[PDB]
Write a protein that binds this ligand. Sequence first.
Ligand SMILES: CCC1=C(C)/C(=C/C2=NC(=C\c3[nH]c(/C=C4\NC(=O)[C@H](C)[C@H]4CC)c(C)c3CCC(=O)O)/C(CCC(=O)O)=C2C)NC1=O
Ligand SMILES: CCC1=C(C)/C(=C/C2=NC(=C\c3[nH]c(/C=C4\NC(=O)[C@H](C)[C@H]4CC)c(C)c3CCC(=O)O)/C(CCC(=O)O)=C2C)NC1=O
Ligand SMILES: CCC1=C(C)/C(=C/C2=NC(=C\c3[nH]c(/C=C4\NC(=O)[C@H](C)[C@H]4CC)c(C)c3CCC(=O)O)/C(CCC(=O)O)=C2C)NC1=O
Ligand SMILES: CCC1=C(C)/C(=C/C2=NC(=C\c3[nH]c(/C=C4\NC(=O)[C@H](C)[C@H]4CC)c(C)c3CCC(=O)O)/C(CCC(=O)O)=C2C)NC1=O
Ligand SMILES: CCC1=C(C)/C(=C/C2=NC(=C\c3[nH]c(/C=C4\NC(=O)[C@H](C)[C@H]4CC)c(C)c3CCC(=O)O)/C(CCC(=O)O)=C2C)NC1=O
Ligand SMILES: CCC1=C(C)/C(=C/C2=NC(=C\c3[nH]c(/C=C4\NC(=O)[C@H](C)[C@H]4CC)c(C)c3CCC(=O)O)/C(CCC(=O)O)=C2C)NC1=O
Ligand SMILES: CCC1=C(C)/C(=C/C2=NC(=C\c3[nH]c(/C=C4\NC(=O)[C@H](C)[C@H]4CC)c(C)c3CCC(=O)O)/C(CCC(=O)O)=C2C)NC1=O
Ligand SMILES: CCC1=C(C)/C(=C/C2=NC(=C\c3[nH]c(/C=C4\NC(=O)[C@H](C)[C@H]4CC)c(C)c3CCC(=O)O)/C(CCC(=O)O)=C2C)NC1=O
Ligand SMILES: CCC1=C(C)/C(=C/C2=NC(=C\c3[nH]c(/C=C4\NC(=O)[C@H](C)[C@H]4CC)c(C)c3CCC(=O)O)/C(CCC(=O)O)=C2C)NC1=O
Lengths: 45, 65, 159, 160, 160, 160, 160, 98, 159, 159, 159, 159
Amino acid sequence: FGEDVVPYPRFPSLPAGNYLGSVQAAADLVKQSWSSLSPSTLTGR
Amino acid sequence: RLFKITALVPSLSRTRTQRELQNTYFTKLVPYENWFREQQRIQKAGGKIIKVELATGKQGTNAGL
Amino acid sequence: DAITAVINSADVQGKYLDTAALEKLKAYFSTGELRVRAATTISANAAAIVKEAVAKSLLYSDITRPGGNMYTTRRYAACIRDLDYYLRYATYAMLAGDPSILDERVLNGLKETYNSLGVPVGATVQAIQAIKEVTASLVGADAGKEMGIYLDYISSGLS
Amino acid sequence: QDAITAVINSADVQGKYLDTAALEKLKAYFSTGELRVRAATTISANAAAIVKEAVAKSLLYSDITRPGGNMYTTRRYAACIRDLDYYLRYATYAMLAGDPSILDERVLNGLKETYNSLGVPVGATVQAIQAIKEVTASLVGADAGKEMGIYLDYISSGLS
Amino acid sequence: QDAITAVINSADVQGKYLDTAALEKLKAYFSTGELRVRAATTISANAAAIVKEAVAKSLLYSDITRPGGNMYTTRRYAACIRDLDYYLRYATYAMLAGDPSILDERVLNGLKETYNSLGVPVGATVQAIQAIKEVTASLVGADAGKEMGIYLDYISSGLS
Amino acid sequence: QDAITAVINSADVQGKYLDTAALEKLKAYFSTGELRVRAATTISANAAAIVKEAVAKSLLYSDITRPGGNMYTTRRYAACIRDLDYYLRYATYAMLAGDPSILDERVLNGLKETYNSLGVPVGATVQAIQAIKEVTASLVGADAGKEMGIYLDYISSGLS
Amino acid sequence: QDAITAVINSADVQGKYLDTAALEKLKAYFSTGELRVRAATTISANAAAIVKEAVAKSLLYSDITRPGGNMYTTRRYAACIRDLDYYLRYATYAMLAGDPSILDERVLNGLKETYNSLGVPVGATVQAIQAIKEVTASLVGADAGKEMGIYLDYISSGLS
Amino acid sequence: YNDGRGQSVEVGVGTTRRKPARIYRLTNGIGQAEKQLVINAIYRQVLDVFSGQVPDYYRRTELDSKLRNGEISVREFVREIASSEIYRKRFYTPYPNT
Amino acid sequence: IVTKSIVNADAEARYLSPGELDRIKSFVAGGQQRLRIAQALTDNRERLVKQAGDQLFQKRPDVVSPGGNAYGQEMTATCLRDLDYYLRLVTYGIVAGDVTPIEEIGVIGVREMYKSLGTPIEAVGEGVRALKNAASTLLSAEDAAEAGSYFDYVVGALQ
Amino acid sequence: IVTKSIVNADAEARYLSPGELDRIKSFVAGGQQRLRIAQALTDNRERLVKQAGDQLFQKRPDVVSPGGNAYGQEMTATCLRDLDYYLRLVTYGIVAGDVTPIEEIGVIGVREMYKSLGTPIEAVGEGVRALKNAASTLLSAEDAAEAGSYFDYVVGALQ
Amino acid sequence: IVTKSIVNADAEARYLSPGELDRIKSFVAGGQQRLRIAQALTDNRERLVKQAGDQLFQKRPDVVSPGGNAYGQEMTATCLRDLDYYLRLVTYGIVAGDVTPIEEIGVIGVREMYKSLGTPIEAVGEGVRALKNAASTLLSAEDAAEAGSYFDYVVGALQ
Amino acid sequence: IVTKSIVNADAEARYLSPGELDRIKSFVAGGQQRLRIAQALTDNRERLVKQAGDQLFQKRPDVVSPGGNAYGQEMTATCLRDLDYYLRLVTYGIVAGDVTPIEEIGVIGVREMYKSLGTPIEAVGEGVRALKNAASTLLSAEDAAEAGSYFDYVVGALQ
Ligand SMILES: CCC1=C(C)/C(=C/C2=NC(=C\c3[nH]c(/C=C4\NC(=O)[C@H](C)[C@H]4CC)c(C)c3CCC(=O)O)/C(CCC(=O)O)=C2C)NC1=O
Ligand SMILES: CCC1=C(C)/C(=C/C2=NC(=C\c3[nH]c(/C=C4\NC(=O)[C@H](C)[C@H]4CC)c(C)c3CCC(=O)O)/C(CCC(=O)O)=C2C)NC1=O
Ligand SMILES: CCC1=C(C)/C(=C/C2=NC(=C\c3[nH]c(/C=C4\NC(=O)[C@H](C)[C@H]4CC)c(C)c3CCC(=O)O)/C(CCC(=O)O)=C2C)NC1=O
Ligand SMILES: CCC1=C(C)/C(=C/C2=NC(=C\c3[nH]c(/C=C4\NC(=O)[C@H](C)[C@H]4CC)c(C)c3CCC(=O)O)/C(CCC(=O)O)=C2C)NC1=O
Ligand SMILES: CCC1=C(C)/C(=C/C2=NC(=C\c3[nH]c(/C=C4\NC(=O)[C@H](C)[C@H]4CC)c(C)c3CCC(=O)O)/C(CCC(=O)O)=C2C)NC1=O
Ligand SMILES: CCC1=C(C)/C(=C/C2=NC(=C\c3[nH]c(/C=C4\NC(=O)[C@H](C)[C@H]4CC)c(C)c3CCC(=O)O)/C(CCC(=O)O)=C2C)NC1=O
Ligand SMILES: CCC1=C(C)/C(=C/C2=NC(=C\c3[nH]c(/C=C4\NC(=O)[C@H](C)[C@H]4CC)c(C)c3CCC(=O)O)/C(CCC(=O)O)=C2C)NC1=O
Ligand SMILES: CCC1=C(C)/C(=C/C2=NC(=C\c3[nH]c(/C=C4\NC(=O)[C@H](C)[C@H]4CC)c(C)c3CCC(=O)O)/C(CCC(=O)O)=C2C)NC1=O
Ligand SMILES: CCC1=C(C)/C(=C/C2=NC(=C\c3[nH]c(/C=C4\NC(=O)[C@H](C)[C@H]4CC)c(C)c3CCC(=O)O)/C(CCC(=O)O)=C2C)NC1=O
């Protein structure tokens, strides 16, 4: 990256098997609740 | 607590086509805790450090920073 | 786009753009005029579209009651931003004339995300259908069904 | 830094312990800390109304809010609200600490050079801070009002 | 999640308020919270001695610490110390919350797959956690010891 | 900032709207914008040949490219090429904006201190920028050539 | 991992020291290490010519480089060059280590799933790696050529 | 011969994965709307805003002041916004350390 | 206050501080009085909600004006239900000692929600201020300081 | 459109694209018609602002109600001055072709501003919609499409 | 120009601008003339490629020199095929209005490619300049400005 | 698979034909991979039942609904116990190499059992499909193929 450059998602080819891991890493989508004070019931209603 | 730094770091890798003015020359406020390793990074990259100034802190403060 | 889809299809073939591809491009230009007008009239009142859609479909049900997926204030705001997202992407896929950008953008992982979070699918399908009715009433007939093609593509991808 | 940590630091530079003079300072700080807590609640109640009344008393319908002034643009007006809001919040913090050094180290470090470089007028900020001081002195009370006004005047003197 | 937030979440799924059954649960939690605080202090006193006594009782002078075992290497031994230090610290947190769900969500989420993939033996970890349970039950007391042992056995059952 | 945004900013500091004087400035800017577009294409055609001809005319076979000069080393020569490539690119941007303030804010902010601290000679850069000005004036045309030369001379005057 | 660290790790799992069998393996590794160094120099000489001759022998003028193939696009052709450049470089590293496990852990970890997901053909890569093997065997020599070919065939077998 | 239709331009890595959509760099002098766009881009990448048009996630006041002034560097902002309890509550406590 | 102390000591690598254990001890000691305040607010649910809503309509007649949102019996019933929800969250926050139940049930995404519902935020806030004044008049004096300061958090966080 | 094209080619390392130079050429070609539209809107400042404000007070009588913000001659004069400011920014955006003058003079921080002023956002937006309708009736037809689409940006960005 | 406008409005949080919708409208209006230019360039494929390649060999005899790369019938046939490929990409860029088809099919990694092939870059660039001159002589005048400016992008991007 | 060939050659009066001996030798060779696949499915059972219940109750919410069979904690625990049983029988079929010891315990009379229990069989088939998907994510490609073999047999059997 750079200093004034904002970080940006990029897919390197030099380390082995890192492309697949970065695709799966950017494809999870933060699949949990951040607070989780009250859990919603099964299929909501 | 906060240092006012001003340093230049040249490019000893291949030359970059992005302007990169800020990387070459910058002035930024760094906290006291990160300043040792951040200085050490500029120490590593072979860049000159021009101006170091304590922005917030007072010297010789034993408690309360 | 539709243009880049035409170019990619001709590039796979290895030939140039002769008259069949040119006629597809003329067709795309003729519909692109009304597509621009529909993009303006959709970006006018996107908030009112999402508001009318949730008021028609999701409000006063069990999911917005205590013991539902849309009970909490954080969850209600996530619902608003997801429907806002479906309207905005369907606008993008309408202007491209091509649903592959829409698929690659949201239908990549939204299935697993709504699986893991426990979000109901069918209520989202009903909400997307309510968005489709509201935008078809607001914009017009042919641009309304052009919007509805990609909104139904979203609703079929989630199901 | 608090008043407590200031007392401890003063005794630590001396190298002695906390005997009766420092203990009496700490008892004084505890006795005022009760009303300081009550004033913090009543300030955090209506901070938005305090900033609104202050800008309506001082900054509105002037040349700086007119076209050709520092507060003309909508982003500049929002920066003014935020800046005014910050002065109230950090004066609340310096009131609860009983010590203005945290306030000085927080904002008066670089706000002088920032308002110099951006061309922000100093005296209009001093008038706005004085209007905040009057509004909070009318809202909270007499002695907690002047306790708030000590640190607000410290901010206004540091900017000048 | 606490016991308090668990009570609030259970009443919120019901959609009612906190009447006398939930209030009596909260009074129970407050009465045990006093000794829970005292046990947290006496556990944070000598956590290093607890881990040292546990590994000296269970893991040392065996085949896993010999050449040809999982704890042979110096980095592996340090990882073992830090894992037992974790189990003690998170059992302390789950003791003070009065609720094991934070402990489950924190470590039992992925430690099963991690110990599967690294080849770490499960039963030696269960023995080490049981040795931690005995050492803390001898150190703290009877009822706070079994309160600690409930969440330590929850960890040991989650790994198995 | 463009010429259009400069006109709008000047009218905004006045607080009035865009009447006939500003409209005539905008019509002037549109009439020159056609040939400005054509010059941007013909400059982006052979920017590499422009920098090559400029360094071959001015900087090569001198003392600075010899051992004991600023352009001796291979990384220093590449930095020279990329700096002249920049001056051409930003003079193209300032030509298309019709306004040199973006160019000034873009490079003349810190290039004076940078060339001071690195020991880069100023006058050789001024000669190289003048050679770029001659090459682009010969390549593009008369009036677009002098339009390019206005901002290139602005760069050369800002470095001096 | 080297051949030396492999010998040390095998003796460490046994728990004994390095006596005469391991010492004779190390003497063998030293005797081949001389010609391994000479082959590393003569491979790093003309790696670009090796990749060029390999793609000219195998991949060019086929259906994959034609429109409608995996190597049609200019970025795809550059990715092909850099992948073959990698296979040569990591086969050089695995030759100098005398051990293919570093090569396996480096590239054969995820390149199978990557070439699966991208739709890259496997057999054309196997043909290209075989062409690299022939070119390096013709360039370096007989025994260092087959030493290179052992790890290149290890790559080609790992991709298949 | 296009027998299996060859391969399109985006079948491999793709046009979209090859290059990022935009790269944002802070400068000393810049347009104010552009400055706000870069500041929002740091939240969008770091805090995982899911492409929200407005960041609902809370913005530190001192940080926005320091970054429009440009007195602290951008990586320092990245450090300070990652250590804030917004990011702690969103990603540290719900997940295991691995 | 236990959850917040635990996550704050979780962000650091260290245990719970002696200061924080004093905080938990003082919270346990005041917990019985907090249960008494929750008892009074539970049993005064009806008249507190009705007096606060009618004080709101005395202050702000725009909502019950026919151009306003709370026009009609059903809309004003949902208005009083919203005030009921916020009083319930205030009782939860008085019991817990944290404001994390108030926050993650009713604060965190309420601005975007009431923007999409067409409802003004400031009138919600004025109604919760009326709840604060009513519950301040019902309770004991410094007990009302305790209740009204959680009410004060809700009021300041809604705006 | 020159500033936006330059900063977009500035984010990349490359020059201005042939597509973008076609955009600048088409913008120059339409610039004279845009100056004609600016001429008409400059000369119709009074009656457009008054008709739009009175259409707003016909639609929304809450602002000129005595509980509302625009109660009194001075407050309603500042209301009409706000509508004047927004019509001026719309003329700037019609001339420039960008919406960056509209944005960085009057859009970027307007929500927090009108929150602190006590003024409702939606009534501002309805007044700018009334300006859009009035200027649409004054101008030529597809010229009114051009003017009303910048008005549409202002309306959608205020809400 | 639709893909670039959509991704540029995607980087921001907002919709498509009125300026950008004017760009799309003007692109649709010029699209039929662009299809006419593509018709002429498709039908003049042979003689344009041969005249440009022979102009290249008149300017640069190093490639067809026996030390050069394009020595022999097969090598010079691949030379003319490369010029054919670049003329095809120029027609794609004239139709699309973007240079993203030219870029991501034939520009983005061409330097490393022709470095590994042993082929000089500048002679490719001189051949595409010869294509620009030939197609400029074939077409109508400001139509040739349109075609030659995309050719100009290819020429400047190859070097 | 040895009992299959033995009763197969036992119905005949002939011995085991040596092609059957070849298939027994090949199964004997592949038994180590079979044992590793079975142990990998063995130690990770509760993850698979969790993700299967996830994907099933995500897919069919009627078992969650009170008219369905798996309503309440006891019935949903019996449901996940049934999924645990089927995962156990799948591991038995993975070791045995042929589907006889899994059909003998789980398939041969399942339709009348689930009919006289009230549960639908299609939801059980979807549960085993979810188990197959989770085990496909858990294993490598050649392991997931060979596990999805017997999972596929169960899914075909329950229908
Ligand atoms: C985009 C706006 C912009 C510009 C122009 C810019 C210039 C710039 N030129 C630099 C160095 C340099 N600049 C030169 C330039 C020259 N030497 C000469 O003799 C000539 C007079 C002149 C060439 C015509 C040289 C030789 C160096 C490297 C000196 C060293 O080895 O430290 C450096 C230090 C880092 C580096 O690139 O190595 C910067 C930041 N940065 C920017 O952001
Ligand atoms: C840009 C493409 C894209 C999309 C669409 C996307 C969605 C997405 N929605 C999420 C959550 C959510 N999604 C919803 C959605 C809804 N609730 C309902 O009842 C309705 C059926 C639906 C609203 C219409 C809710 C309530 C949450 C939060 C659930 C929780 O508290 O965990 C999450 C988890 C993190 C978070 O945002 O909180 C993601 C990643 N991510 C992406 O990258
Ligand atoms: C250093 C160890 C290592 C390797 C080897 C590696 C390979 C690798 N090759 C890739 C793509 C690629 N690989 C190829 C390869 C080929 N096409 C063919 O027809 C041939 C069979 C083969 C060339 C001989 C192509 C064409 C692409 C790009 C496909 C696309 O457009 O998506 C990618 C995806 C990102 C990219 O580079 O574009 C990775 C990560 N990464 C690593 O870390
Ligand atoms: C938390 C401690 C702290 C403070 C106080 C702070 C202030 C601060 N005020 C600023 C700008 C500003 N400050 C003002 C302030 C005013 N204009 C006037 O006429 C009045 C005199 C005064 C309002 C009462 C204005 C108008 C700007 C924006 C000027 C511009 O457009 O550049 C900026 C530059 C970036 C920005 O916010 O836009 C900073 C960093 N930063 C901090 O970290
Ligand atoms: C805070 C919650 C939490 C936990 C518990 C956790 C554990 C954890 N333990 C690990 C390794 C390890 N864990 C052990 C543990 C043991 N070996 C044995 O024989 C015993 C049965 C057991 C010690 C009692 C060993 C030896 C390793 C290193 C194995 C290797 O060399 O790869 C690793 C891999 C990275 C590393 O630390 O080296 C993680 C992530 N991570 C977390 O976030
Ligand atoms: C526990 C946290 C929580 C809150 C706050 C909440 C509010 C909430 N308010 C609603 C409607 C409403 N809310 C109001 C509110 C008001 N009238 C005004 O003018 C005042 C400012 C305000 C009274 C405070 C009105 C008038 C409606 C009906 C609007 C409609 O039906 O479209 C609805 C949709 C219908 C419903 O399901 O009841 C919800 C979900 N839900 C929640 O779960
Ligand atoms: C160029 C960008 C720009 C805008 C938008 C702007 C607005 C603006 N509106 C103001 C007041 C006001 N604005 C309104 C507005 C309205 N009445 C309503 O109900 C409607 C929703 C709305 C009419 C659109 C009212 C009633 C006041 C007086 C409020 C007061 O005096 O407290 C004030 C304070 C007094 C003044 O200086 O005039 C400003 C600065 N200033 C700017 O520089
Ligand atoms: C659509 C984008 C695209 C381009 C540009 C492209 C070029 C390309 N040029 C090639 C060879 C070649 N290219 C040239 C080119 C030239 N002779 C010169 O001196 C001139 C500078 C230049 C004419 C412009 C020559 C001489 C060869 C044969 C070299 C060899 O066979 O080793 C090859 C390998 C053989 C083949 O598959 O045809 C490719 C793939 N392929 C593509 O898919
Ligand atoms: C190893 C061979 C074997 C099978 C196949 C088996 C099935 C089996 N399923 C049962 C109940 C049940 N089975 C289910 C099944 C389901 N939940 C649903 O909604 C879906 C349709 C399905 C699973 C996802 C339910 C809900 C019950 C409780 C029904 C009741 O209590 O009447 C029962 C009666 C209670 C018991 O003793 O466990 C048996 C015997 N038992 C066996 O020993």
